[PDB]
């Protein structure tokens, strides 16, 4: 029997040693994976107060950002396309104004 | 002797299957919160040298942003409280031209 | 050769029991950094459907943020440099407009 003891002991040990090998080589797949998760997630940064779009060297871009909502309280991010259908609206009233000027101007004239 | 040598191997052994087992169970619920941070952080994407906030198959919104610094070179995030202040006061504008050129228009019919 | 044997055994538990010791203390900086990431990476929330900025009680700023493009279907964040130059010209339009109004007032003044 202590023969046959000793080697259902060593059956236990050659499992425990190979149990033990899944885990090494997948903690570090894990260990790799919460690198990596530090590296590229856009995280908070204590000495600023915010979050920090920081990134390979410097400020980053956000993109794919869906439209954030236009009102008084709103704590929605907004996106370029918005921005854009203003800077439209300003460059028109620049023109506007412009030819308003030209237009009393051309009155003055005529007193 | 031996037989007891025996039993404080396998008094070991049990031992080292069940802190085994308590780190097998533990590894999983990692494992797990490593892929749901990966899923539901916003992430930089390489391929587009950005953050991206896609999600659920789309853009996605970034809410809960408070009010970004107005400045020359500010790197602050803006929200969509501080761009409806300036629809708001673009649609002004827009109604004040309006009337300006109808002011403009009865004095051209005075004349 | 049991004795032997029963020292080989002895030997490769030992070896066994650090192995584990290496684990635990790994395993728990790890748990660790994945409790970090969770607290201070810029997560989506589901009950809302967009990533939410909340940090720390309360909405928080994105710095750090690169300009985006201003274009028509443009998903990119915007930021307040973008939205002050935005801000710059509507507080020149406002004192333009009112200096037309004093002219067209002049000219009423005139006739």
């Known amino acids: 029997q202590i023969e046959d003891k000793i080697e259902e002991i060593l059956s236990k040990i050659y499992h425990i040693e190979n149990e033990i090998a899944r885990?090494?080589?997948?903690?570090?797949?894990?260990?790799a994976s919460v690198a990596g998760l530090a590296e590229d997630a856009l995280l908070w940064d204590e000495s600023i107060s915010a979050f920090s779009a920081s990134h390979t060297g410097?400020?980053?871009?956000?993109?794919?950002?869906?439209?954030?909502?236009?009102?008084?309280?709103?704590?929605?991010?907004?996106?370029?396309?918005?921005?854009?259908?203003?800077?439209?609206?300003?460059?028109?009233?620049?023109?506007?104004?412009?030819?308003?000027?030209?237009?009393?101007?051309?009155?003055?004239?005529?007193?």
């Not at 885990?23 to 260990?31: A, P, R």
């Not at 309280?73 to 009233?93: H, L, P, R």
Request: glycine fraction near 4%.
């Open 58 to 111: 410097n400020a980053s871009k956000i993109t794919n950002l869906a439209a954030g909502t236009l009102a008084a309280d709103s704590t929605d991010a907004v996106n370029g396309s918005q921005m854009k259908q203003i800077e439209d609206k300003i460059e028109e009233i620049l023109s506007k104004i412009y030819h308003i000027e030209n237009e009393i101007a051309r009155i003055k004239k005529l007193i």
């Open 23 to 31: 885990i090494k080589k997948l903690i570090t797949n894990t260990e």
